[PDB]
């Protein structure tokens, strides 16, 4: 640790002089101990002229005292001398014309010392930015020039500092104020210290540094003055480490290395006063995962019961430092709701708010109104001796004193507007008031909370009205400590204490204990240690002896240093690696600037009306806010300059919202101020109804379809009804460990799902509709340790002492290892196959490099954290591929390029993608640009898209954006009819075929029929049907297909498809526990594929590179060699000597597939490949693919016999043929029909995609050929692989030939395609989705397992705090949830993922997920 430690803060954030008071008190104590003289005695002979820099004066005086008395040697001496020189520099007057320059320099030196003194400490970019801001705040010069001139002027500065130090020392070496103004001079150096000491700082001023006892005084001062010239003269030596010259040299070196509102003034002190109170902030920067960092109090808040009808939660709050509540009737140092009160002390009146924070008040409050700072709540008296507290809102709290105005208790509360009120009835015994009954006379309901007491007058039971079963029960020890609390559900929480009311251990309702240890047994003792019973999260806290800093050591002794202000606000956090996060606050403690650990800077500006008017984003984007005379946010201007307008009703509710394109949304609210009606920009009207509790009970969409929710009197969701009158019923446990929690769900088909939870809500057992059980086990600390599926196979999790995932054991017992560096960041991942990924981080802590066995991925970032570029270097061959990205001021990807492509994205004022240029840079082909145009309706629905060759696709929408017709070149190709759920029940195709779809009770496709709208005997039109039968787990058990006959499927307990019977083919699939197909037919084959990379399957043999990519597939008579680029993308395939080359754009979208002379171009619209153009000597054609709305399911293909006509990088060709797709329940094309409705193409494919037989009327007609397969899959005849956006799928082995780019986020088995291809798709090759149940009622449960919300009354107490974190604008309000009602600001239609990686140094996702790889 450095010998000298400093608290550097922005000067604007300090309003009190408490630190100055402590420094003055320390100086006075030093004088009394050494010279035995008070400051008054030395005042007379202390006439010295210095600048009016109070911080510099106090720092210099204290440093001189320490130098004279607390002599030091070694590096500590150098550091202390450097700090003394810095303080003296900004104190001497001499050249007054340079006073401001010196005053600005001194905090500069303080900051340089703070960054550089610590071991392995270096000047970072954030430090240089802070120095520049501080310099520009006052003089508005240049950092480099100022530092250079200071370096040149350093010698004279040191001489002046030595003279000043000599003069100061020649005051106490012989036997006998609040303004930081560079233009003012201090006549006497001692006088300002005395003036400071006089003020009533309201802060403890006990000196924290004990003088040397030995009263050297004159002798020590003489030795000081003797050595001061020697120590300061050597300060100019740049060779010596930890000296001002060295600090300047290092800062200049860092500036050189890194160069390839009215600023922010900084100040520093070496001695600080103790934090007066904890901050209102409860974030991770102010308290432990709880011990408050500012004051060290151990605080636990436990809720014993909830009154939903009034939204009241009985919150018991413990505070280990609350000796004022030692006699609390709910346990020593415990606070219950409404227990807040005002007590008389020597200083005056002490008020303890509901949260437990203490605010001192003057004795004059009982005679006049008083307002507290930084909080905004006022206290005023009344002529009757009661004090009214306005905490913010319509609630007024009345306080009465029952003993000579000593203790004021809360007797009643007033809601002046709503007339709601609460009375407190107190039983007065021996002039001691004991709360007896709480009267909740509220419009919601009338509740009578009565308390039963024991012989000690301690609440042992809380009763509601006349109910016999108490809402809570409490037990106490002989010392009055609350040792057991039973909640309304019968669950128990135990508490353990030492002999001094200090909570040493407490258990949650499952018995899992949290332990606390304290520095001492005194009430004001800080908690210094906490750990879970098993030892996890063992946190040690060490408070700095001199500064308002605490070092918080995690379970591995990795320190995080927090600095807090006099009011407890954490203004600076320093990590172990040296990265620092700063908060700048103004005089009102409003966060004006935040510089995060990764260097992102956010600024916030406020006007004279205390309104947030400007936000400057890290990327430099400026958000501006404007307000009307009523203080309502009317105008929002985003970084792109687009303007959002709002208008308000009388209740300060947003009634009208105008977006930058002029589209208007209107809102109506009930007297409750709850959204009751929204009129969209197209005139559609949505209706919302609420029950008396304020819970939404009915929602009618703009199409008139109404869904309803039923709640019981208590307010628990008992049933919800869909627009098609299907009811899901919810039932809750009435007994046991999960009493009051969701126990079972009854679905409209009558099938039931059962849940079992522990007392804390953890899911322990899930029983699905088929009765199959999934069990979850949790370790001692409560983290998930084992998930046992219905197959009895288990996935085990092992966590390190900080809760980070350490080892993941899949069903095959293969281990996924996660390694973290001494700073706790993820630096190593070992996959199930043994592949090791090593992560490195740059000076900003962002993922710098991913080192895989073959490829070194390197990330470059913009200052705002967006990925500027990625490079992929082969560690052996050395070949490098790079990608570049650009973003607009809204952080939206505006350009992305790689070797073979550049994509430019253009957006309108709403952020909707309107134009997209796709520049193809294919080798051997002339560059060409494909341009997409998009148009949207007033609701943001895409209605028109112009494809690169001029062909336009039109979407006709009704209501909120439901598609009822699709037009191709203003010619309808399909029209849709939808049911009350807006699901397609009928479609009419332009080829005269109509398809009707029916759904069963749970919303699964039950049948689909296709037939001619008007039958004609001239030709055989396509008529077919599929009838779907499901099992109790909603797995497709049978299909009645008119063409294929009966298709029978069997599944394993976890829903994996293991058999398929049909007339064409019978298939049996054997999976290992991890989900790999195993060659069960061959005995020699392994029973499990431990590495999830099968080496052989049914006559096929695979070889992999070191990154898991299949490099060669060998079978009888075929040898397929696959060449992979540095991004694990197939760039060359060699099938029996036939070479095919591929290329991809930045987003992994395949742009071309070149085989000898034949070239196949592909074009994409978002995630859909919308056209393919074939080029060759003989044949040229272009095919367009039209898909069902918002889906990967193809609708039709149309094309012309010519290569696509695209713009050449710096007249529409009529479509000749139309072919209509007919897909099955999972969106897989099964047949295709021509414009006359005749079947021209049929496919029989194996269960996992392999083609078994294709029947085509016209074999050589390209427009009647189909390569589309499972959603998002494109069959490649060259390799027999299915291209799947990001990966190539291998139908034979039902797996991808490369590892999932997103790792475990896409599933435990990073090579498996889908468990059940009858209903799951995986269209992009990243994540498997259940397509069959996407439109199912079971997939719309308002309460899945714990999705319950009840916060009807947060009112009671509240303070209002924007002083804790920076405000993220995002959508601003969002408004109402549920069916979806409310928008504003933000929003990006047609979102674009830069590279889909973004991140990946993440873990601990509970449900299967490890990385942050998007």
Residue numbers in the entry: 14 to 189, 204 to 287, 305 to 333, 335 to 1255, 1280 to 1483
What does the paper say about this structure?
The type VI secretion system (T6SS) is a molecular machine utilised by many Gram-negative bacteria to deliver antibacterial toxins into adjacent cells. Tse15 is cleaved into three domains, through independent auto-cleavage events involving aspartyl protease activity for toxin self-cleavage and a nucleophilic glutamic acid for N-terminal clade cleavage.
We mutated the equivalent two aspartic acid residues (D1369N, D1391N) to asparagine in a single construct (Tse15NN). SDS-PAGE analysis of the purified Tse15NN showed only two protein fragments, compared to the three observed during purification of wildtype Tse15. The identity of this toxin protein fragment was confirmed by mass spectrometry peptide fingerprinting, thus confirming that wildtype Tse15 possesses aspartyl protease activity that drives self-cleavage of the toxin from the Rhs domain. Unlike wildtype Tse15, particle processing for the cryo-EM data of Tse15NN showed only one main monomeric 3D particle class with the clade domain predicted to be retained together with the body of the Rhs cage. Clear, connective density was observed after L1395 and the sequence of the toxin could be mapped up to residue 1484, guided by a difference map as well as the unsharpened map. After residue 1484, significant breaks in connective density meant that the C-terminal of the toxin could not be placed into the maps. Overall, the position of the Tse15NN toxin was similar but not the same as the wildtype Tse15, and lacked defined secondary structure features.
